[PDB]
Enzyme design. Sequence first.
Site, PDB file in Angstrom:
ATOM      1  N   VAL A 107       0.807  -1.213   0.000  1.00 14.97           N
ATOM      2  CA  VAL A 107       0.000   0.000   0.000  1.00 14.97           C
ATOM      3  C   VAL A 107       0.842   1.266   0.000  1.00 14.97           C
ATOM      4  CG1 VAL A 107      -1.834  -1.169   1.200  1.00 14.97           C
ATOM      5  CG2 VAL A 107      -0.131   0.121   2.484  1.00 14.97           C
ATOM      6  N   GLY A 118      11.230   2.633   3.986  1.00 13.26           N
ATOM      7  CA  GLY A 118      10.833   1.239   3.885  1.00 13.26           C
ATOM      8  C   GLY A 118       9.547   1.039   3.106  1.00 13.26           C
ATOM      9  N   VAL A 167       5.619  -0.695   2.891  1.00 10.06           N
ATOM     10  CA  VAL A 167       4.516  -1.028   3.771  1.00 10.06           C
ATOM     11  C   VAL A 167       3.471  -1.896   3.067  1.00 10.06           C
ATOM     12  CG1 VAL A 167       2.652  -0.149   5.190  1.00 10.06           C
ATOM     13  CG2 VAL A 167       4.805   1.126   5.078  1.00 10.06           C
ATOM     14  N   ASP A 190       3.509   8.948  12.601  1.00 13.31           N
ATOM     15  CA  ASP A 190       4.617   9.474  11.802  1.00 13.31           C
ATOM     16  C   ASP A 190       5.410  10.566  12.491  1.00 13.31           C
ATOM     17  OD1 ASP A 190       4.086   7.681   9.791  1.00 13.31           O
ATOM     18  OD2 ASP A 190       3.666   9.181   8.238  1.00 13.31           O
TER      19      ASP A 190
HETATM   20 MG   LIG Z   1       3.008  10.907   7.132  1.00 15.62          MG
END
Ligand SMILES: [Mg+2]
Length: 349
Positions: A27, A33, A35, A165
Amino acid sequence: ERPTFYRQELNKTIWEVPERYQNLSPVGSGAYGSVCAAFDTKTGLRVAVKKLSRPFQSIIHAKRTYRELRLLKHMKHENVIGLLDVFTPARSLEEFNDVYLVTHLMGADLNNIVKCQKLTDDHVQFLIYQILRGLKYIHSADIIHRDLKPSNLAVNEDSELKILDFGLARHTDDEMTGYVATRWYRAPEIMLNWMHYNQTVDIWSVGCIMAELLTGRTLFPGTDHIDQLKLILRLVGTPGAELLKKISSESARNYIQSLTQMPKMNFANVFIGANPLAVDLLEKMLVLDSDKRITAAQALAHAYFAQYHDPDDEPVADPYDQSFESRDLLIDEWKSLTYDEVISFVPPP
Ligand SMILES: [Mg+2]
Ligand SMILES: [Mg+2]
């Protein structure tokens, strides 16, 4: 008691994960990285599985991997993303190379939901309340998010919100250049490195977010750092002598003094029709002098949140030791530290 892993080629890379994680579907992927969304058969939860890319390619990246892991392992709060699981297919430190982080799959963020959209006052109260609730927790651990913006706020169908995040690695200069949302929510003191910033930069961001939820428009959509500063000073007024002194950089201070002075505007005439309590809170958050901005703990007690505020249900965090940030270690040392954190991880109840 090691789980059984199975391999699968996803995101042009081989993913090796515990059988519990099923139906992996890519996605997203970033410089940090790749996900994949998945179904965790053990919890019954939809999850995001992030495989870091070359987590130990340099000291900087190794320390960042460690930083992110330590941070996610610490966050245990309803309005903050927490770590559901962390694993590696490695069976020993010598074999350790990959790191996978597992977190709740959140439907969507505030951005992909309220885009060019204005929400009702009651809705804004609930959303901002939850952000401040998570922020009180975060700041209580002496952690600064540093990158609060709509896209870093996840919300489910019931409008329940989680902050995610966290700022782990400084954005690139190019990332903050031009007409970009990545900069519209940053406090001025950090946008132009005026001084040693603190947790108060996050409150500035909340203010920008809150104003956008109320109006449906970006508060300070600057086309570049300077344009943005002008949009900000136009609203909150130019720096006074008291704040000017607090600006470390002589260059910054000198440029500031070149600008024609401007008084703070009347927020009631800016946020027309907005709840007077909402206006008052915005004025307390959008204060130029960071020393004078309202704190998350203070903001929660503001009348605007009377309907949700509960001093016995706004927990603070356990102490968070970030002395490692000053540690001077080699890649392998950061790697061994990360390994211990992976194997000592204890699943949340
Ligand atoms: Mg974000
Ligand atoms: Mg509850």
